[PDB]
Design a protein around this ligand. Structure first.
Ligand SMILES: *C(C)CC(=O)c1ccc2cc(OC)ccc2c1
Ligand SMILES: *C(C)CC(=O)c1ccc2cc(OC)ccc2c1
Length: 247
């Protein structure tokens, strides 16, 4: 990984030590990016619902993961499952149980810094993985992209700024998650998020992290080329809100 400071350094060190799983996959790879394109063609708003027991954002919600997943199966384009343990209270067992319970695409959201974590995602039933430009050297990012692609996954590449985008495009990203998160305030910079979206080629599938969980924001972004939306706290708090977001 890159050399880091603070809690990202900590979580990367934890991740490097994470024991791998041994399990045979007995679930198809259900492509998230393709399902998003399908929703776009059908004019159905495509929302990727997070399951996250905790978040550094103040998030502290206990709710049954299977009940949540089965509810979202009806509405969401896919699920994003936090599997990082220390800051998000995630677990591989929770991912496995969720994957064994629904047949919509599942993104394993963690801090992937070694190949065996991609093996873990595959073996546990996830359909793809998050890769984070800001924690990986360029060579690592390219290699891990290729390694995920070796399983038939297309990873979601997380960018937070223009430097991350330059790297992501150079290494061949085709599925990009645009955050533009400030870690002091914990707020999405909407202006910058929009600038980044405008800089992405038309042949990249684009997912925006939503801070403001409202229909009008979705409509503006969709107009600007965004294909799908990641939404976390508001859906963990009130799952049924997704219905009003998709109309
Ligand atoms: C989960 C709700 C968000 C998450 O897992 C995550 C990971 C890494 C990351 C890096 C950023 O900048 C480099 C911004 C946001 C973010 C969110
Ligand atoms: C999504 C609207 C917020 C999100 O993904 C996120 C991820 C990680 C993170 C870390 C923080 O501490 C450094 C603060 C906020 C925050 C928000």
């Amino acid at each position: 990984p890159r050399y880091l400071k603070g809690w990202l350094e900590d979580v990367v060190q934890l991740s490097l030590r994470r024991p791998s799983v041994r399990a045979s996959r007995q679930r198809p790879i259900i492509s998230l990016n393709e399902r998003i394109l399908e929703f776009n063609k059908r004019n159905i708003t495509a929302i990727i619902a997070y399951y996250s027991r905790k978040s550094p954002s103040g998030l502290d919600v206990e709710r049954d993961p299977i009940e949540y997943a089965k509810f979202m199966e009806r509405y969401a384009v896919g699920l994003s499952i936090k599997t990082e343990e220390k800051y998000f209270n995630g677990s591989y067992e929770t991912l496995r149980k969720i994957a064994s319970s629904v047949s919509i695409p599942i993104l394993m959201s963690d801090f992937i810094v070694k190949e065996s974590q991609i093996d873990d995602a595959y073996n546990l039933g996830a359909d793809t993985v998050l890769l984070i430009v800001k924690i990986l050297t360029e060579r690592e990012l390219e290699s891990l992209l290729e390694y995920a692609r070796s399983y038939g996954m297309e990873p979601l590449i997380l960018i937070n700024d223009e430097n991350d985008l330059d790297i992501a495009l150079r290494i061949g990203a085709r599925f990009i998650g645009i955050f533009s998160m400030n870690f002091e305030t914990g707020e999405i910079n909407k202006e910058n998020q929009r600038k980044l979206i405008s800089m992405i080629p038309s042949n990249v599938v684009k997912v925006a992290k939503l801070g403001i969980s409202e229909r009008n924001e979705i409509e503006e972004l969709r107009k600007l080329g965004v294909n799908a939306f990641l939404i976390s706290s508001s859906l963990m708090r009130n799952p049924e809100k997704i219905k009003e977001l998709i109309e």
